[PDB]
Amino acid sequence: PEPQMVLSPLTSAAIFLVVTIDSGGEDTVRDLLSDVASLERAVGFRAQPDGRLSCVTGIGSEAWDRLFSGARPAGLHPFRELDGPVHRAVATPGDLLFHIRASRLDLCFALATEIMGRLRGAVTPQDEVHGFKYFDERDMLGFVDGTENPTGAAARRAVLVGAEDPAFAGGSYAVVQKYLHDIDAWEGLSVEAQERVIGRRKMTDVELSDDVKPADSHVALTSVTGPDGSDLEILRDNMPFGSVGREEFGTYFIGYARTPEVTETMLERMFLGTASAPHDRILDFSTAVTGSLFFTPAADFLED
Amino acid sequence: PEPQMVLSPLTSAAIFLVVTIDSGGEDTVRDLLSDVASLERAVGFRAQPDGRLSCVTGIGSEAWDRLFSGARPAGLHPFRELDGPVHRAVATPGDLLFHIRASRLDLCFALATEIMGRLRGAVTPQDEVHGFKYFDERDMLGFVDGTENPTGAAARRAVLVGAEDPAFAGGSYAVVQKYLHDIDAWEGLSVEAQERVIGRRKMTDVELSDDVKPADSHVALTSVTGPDGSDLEILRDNMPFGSVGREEFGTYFIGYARTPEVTETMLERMFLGTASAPHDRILDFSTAVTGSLFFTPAADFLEDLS
Amino acid sequence: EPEPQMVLSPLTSAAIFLVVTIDSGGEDTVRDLLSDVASLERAVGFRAQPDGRLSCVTGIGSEAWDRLFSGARPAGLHPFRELDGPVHRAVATPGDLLFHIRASRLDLCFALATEIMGRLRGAVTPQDEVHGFKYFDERDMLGFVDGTENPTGAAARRAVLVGAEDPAFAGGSYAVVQKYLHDIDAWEGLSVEAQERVIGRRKMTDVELSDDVKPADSHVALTSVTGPDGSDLEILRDNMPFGSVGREEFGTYFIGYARTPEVTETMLERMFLGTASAPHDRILDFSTAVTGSLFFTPAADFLEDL
Amino acid sequence: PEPQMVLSPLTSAAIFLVVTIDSGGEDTVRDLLSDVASLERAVGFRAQPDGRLSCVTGIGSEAWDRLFSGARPAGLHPFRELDGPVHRAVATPGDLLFHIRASRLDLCFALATEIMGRLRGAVTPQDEVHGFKYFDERDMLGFVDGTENPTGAAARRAVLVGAEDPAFAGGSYAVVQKYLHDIDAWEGLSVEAQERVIGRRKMTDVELSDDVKPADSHVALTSVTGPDGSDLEILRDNMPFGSVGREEFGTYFIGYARTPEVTETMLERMFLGTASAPHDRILDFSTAVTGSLFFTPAADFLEDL
Amino acid sequence: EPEPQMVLSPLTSAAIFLVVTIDSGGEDTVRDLLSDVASLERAVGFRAQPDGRLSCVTGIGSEAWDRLFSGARPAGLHPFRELDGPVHRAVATPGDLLFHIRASRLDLCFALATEIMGRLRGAVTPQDEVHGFKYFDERDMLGFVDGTENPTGAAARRAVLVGAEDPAFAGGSYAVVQKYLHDIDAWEGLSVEAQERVIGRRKMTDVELSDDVKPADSHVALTSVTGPDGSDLEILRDNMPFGSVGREEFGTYFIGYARTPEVTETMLERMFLGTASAPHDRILDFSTAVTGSLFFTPAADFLEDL
């Protein structure tokens, strides 16, 4: 089975589109789903090989039941709100996700235009974010972002549904959250205090040794080991976004995994805390304003 | 005198920032102006040679009088509203323009962040547009945009103030208008009818011959000759922008010229018409929602400030 | 595991197509060249890596095969079959060897072609030589994007490489070539909308026409074929513009690769002879075939080991 | 005055088009001349900054008198045949030259298509050559080609008409010749013998010193000093071309200079020789089959027609 | 299932070769660094992706292996074997660890080497450090293209990676290094044709000499070796120029990877000790080896699991 382009080369631009399906809009949606791969080629082919355009399409739990009869993917459920003692992960509505990536924003915008053109009258937009990466892979906090993502065979194993749910093999699960940052408070920390929040050196991107790394650092809390002592991994493609006039400085988080359990365990540790950590210190400078969960089927599923 | 980077190499990203200066904000603004070149180097130097980051700073007519106490540039005045029989060119507030360009949006954003950091508390944002060019220099209407811009020595002559106003030599005048398009109506025209609106072939960008080119086409109305029969020229760096969710598809127009009279004559022809043309047909699919005029001084003028 | 030739190439912007016939007595010289052609490709190309992207695919015709080799023949190898339609004809022309040479620059193609023909002088007669160039936005001589629906990845390997159905020749492929001349004057008299009806896709945006508006005799409708089991039958194409402005020759060199020639031949029958709903492919009313040949392109190992 | 793009950045592709103007063709030609800069922007702008498309337009001596009334450029005359003891530089017909350059052949071809589309029925093609440079600036003989071209202000001085002919300031003179090579004979020389023909090392492109450089080497014969002892220079943009099936391996020579006398002195030395050299040894492996001379006006001259 | 180190790297234009010995008592510090070297590679390289192309291949010598690890040894691991020929000698020099660092720029190599050696200060003693650079047309210091006949694709994986013959160490490889210094004055006194007879290929065009003119003592003849079954035995090389113009040091750093050391060692025997028809490889009359070491480069998983 052929996956969607979940494992994409590095891109410097992205559009995230989240919509809800209006009553009566089901048929229009199903037709667009069967054409989205053809639209990706149409927009992208003439800008190859530099364009690097791809579109990953995801479907939410409630939407799935409205669109399709028969089997559901085993891990598909609505995003679970987390009400921590200090920080909250909100659940917000979303039926479809389009994760559009390329080397330039214009290509993203052209594909998004064709997709939304086909869905006019059948969907209501909930979120639209135009992201850009900094030229040295840094995010809005000034840290390199993406370093420990798995690659090659380890990425496929971490991200693609396999034999445990054979009808849906080659799919994946995406979690999205839009975060806004308090840059004024962040810039009041010394660089060394910032390093203790994240768990890595700022300039050189070397991980802090186990004797200095705090238990409530981002990297400590999002490091999880399975029963067999192996690392449980996700693939992230976080993107800065913002607006200088409205003082909006953000990170759009997106994490792909073979089962939502891995991502959800990381979120629980961050937001609810553990015995050794009250919460993830990154949350003292970062507020989540959306949260949604989607299944991203194999490309062949959509082509039917 | 050293000009600002009005004549930039081609760039694929831009931020347009327009602000008003709040009462009491003048001193903070004057300080920022004397540092803006240093900020451009700070952000841009480490991303050379590919980043191509530049910032052009413009000052409005009413702002100039609040900031500076001596001579005024000869052509600086508030943008003039045009009330045509069908179409209107509105005047909207703006005291400062930052026209930021680079090969990537992140560099534009980083410079804009440092600029606005210094001005917080002293200014109020009026407009912020993040522009992106299509990979084959096309605009949102699907036409190549930029082709007849002047280059080289002809660009310098058309754009930079010279001997006619010697205290302000090396400056320029910028006009900005944000346009929103009705794409549904535009896409209901055949290609040939679109070509009659613009005045050039869509796929190949070859200008229509003089015996087919309508008098109310964009190219006919923006072609102006001087007293001596020479072409009057401006330098444009129009950028697409928009939001697919809100159905906003735009062109941000910016035109630089040695004197505003050239740009204003073109706007009069577009909006008020001529003997042979009621108005520019591009305006039947394009609405202006801002309009402002700025003087962009020589770099030396900004540096030598308090 | 048998190694294919570079049938599945990255995108290239230049090509040379060379078709020759083998003279009487030339067989031994040809066999020696075949055993060296991959070594020549590395010699010319390696020092221009990684940007040169030089490759050569070598093909052998049906009659040539029997003169060169004893033993088994590939199961689908036969001479190209003439199609005599009510209006349009697909001609068969002679050719014993094909060299399909691609790179990012014409000079590299020319240097490899020079070494190959240097070795074959006196043993072969040239039948056709075409120097092809792709337009910068993947467009062909008709102004349409060309290549869009080619298969990629695993689907390309499945569509193009001989496998278990003919195990001695696994890793080979079949190439069909046709040189087309276009009537550009007639083509350019069509509106863009009428050109879109001929091809089956939008010209500027390369979006396929919806199934209810796509004509039955459009290029895309007739070259879309489904198998016994209702799966899409695919080929890999790398069509190249060519021509000469002084002689008014404006062409497309067609080359199509497939695991069996039946798929390509079915598409040709539909184009030239028509179906119940379509007399012929409308692209043929602006395009004349002046060559036609079929070749087997063996696995690289097959050529090396003789 | 704004020159044409005679001083171009380096390009790896070119089309050379030479045509003659038929009976009655003059009006159609003058219309095209007034549009050719606008055509160049139309084709090229959307492929910037990588495309690097330019077109330099030239007009021959006889054509000048048919197209324009009034002043003629001072140095404009028909190409002068040189019938030397062994080698000949032929003259062939040509009224208009279009020298089209870009980073890719397709852009050259697109501009040539629009130009010839406008001239159909008014002109007869005499030559069409599609040129390609090798990836390390080498020519068909395997030597680096271009090295001692002038650059910057020295190029402008060597190439652009100035005060000596003020009505035509910003123009230039182009000489073209199509050369075919005998590759078999060339490749039978050792590398060291080839180096003595050219006057430079093959691999490293270092000039042979004055004590080893033969008097009949290409570099010795095309090195000329003026009355003042200063170097007389031209700007060249030679391109390989050919066809493997027909065994055609060529160099298309094009040389620009402020006055044709510089280029003509070099041609005399190559074909007629000097006291110490019978002829340029490059000519024992290279045959000229075309020869024409053109004036390339300032861009504003063409625009104002 | 085993993940190899980046032995099969894309082409790179810069490299650092670091060879060190492990001091008495340094074993624990070395084991800790080995378990982190892939994490360090990502730390330095990720922010320069995708163009940085940074990789590190780590190798371990025979005597070092027994100091670091208990249990199984790779079947072909032994100290480099000195070859004392009648004229030329291949010396063995000490080395416990190899770090073969490659990228598209030297600064990335240098930054990773700095982090690695920072961790190992006090536990290791440096024996050699070479900063290599590519010529722009893949030439070495002798003026010949270097790398042409290296295997690619599936043939490279088969030639280089340990498989089922030693399943505990599958996905590893064996590296041989030798630093060579050239006598450039003697070399440049030869005619180009005499240089071609030393190497076995044409200098400018890199075309291999035909079998009847290629000398038996040419480099290409002696390093072409066929197995019992008549198949070509191959290695992967990534030779790098280095040197210092003031000290007149012009070198080639030789590095060859193979699935078993016997292939590399057979080539070395032929070069240094000769055959019945060739006393030695003529390249050695202009090239002196000043180092020689053999290393096993484990699968990436083996290093991670420490």
Place this chain on the structure above:
Amino acid sequence: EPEPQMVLSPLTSAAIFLVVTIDSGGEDTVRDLLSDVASLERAVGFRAQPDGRLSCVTGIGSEAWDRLFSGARPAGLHPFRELDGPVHRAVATPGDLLFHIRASRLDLCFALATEIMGRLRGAVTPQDEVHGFKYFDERDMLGFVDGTENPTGAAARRAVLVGAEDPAFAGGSYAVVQKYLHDIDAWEGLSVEAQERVIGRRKMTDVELSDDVKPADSHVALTSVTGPDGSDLEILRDNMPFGSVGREEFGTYFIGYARTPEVTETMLERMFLGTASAPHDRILDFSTAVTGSLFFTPAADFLEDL
């Protein structure tokens, strides 16, 4: 109009600095090489255009000038002046000729240095050879961006080229070189904020510290100088990192060009001897100079006409 050497070069990522002394009797050989060095630069560089960006700036020391030439000398040419401060010393070391070779790749630098040294063998003795590389974000070995406040355009030409104050030598410049080694272990024991107080700029973002926090003994404060008339006195720098990981050598090669040595020497006095408010430049607490030389770089025409 006198043609300068390529002092104002585009940005380069690689360099070779070569400093030699002229042996007794070597004068004639040197004069011949000087008259050929521009021809050699084109020979090596032309075939790598337009990306190679190869250039060579040749400098002559005070004592060498008097050995090579008769007549008038440039007005500011003297041996480098030793500075003996209370804590820190600037040493003077021998050097008669400087070759400052820059390009986009090291191999081009190396090839030109090889040709230059080939012509001088037996006439000169090498004193220093450094192969420099820039970090990918223009950072130096201290981790700060390096070059940001260099002048550009017309302001650079005014700062660096001799003019009417010494008209026989117009178009020349003066270069000062110092090789610095850093104590990285001590430097890395500072916090980022303490490092920023040493340099005078923010580490990550390269924004200059405000005048109210910038210490008087920071690098940027001490190297900022105004003339009597209030104008900025500027130099043009092209500092390059270099080093060797095995020897723990981490360096910055300093080179500064100026129209008169007085500007450079005033900055050096402030750094090494201090001012009223600053004992010395804090950068020197982590940086030791081990070479120091001064050269005049003539106009290109001067070298050609020898």
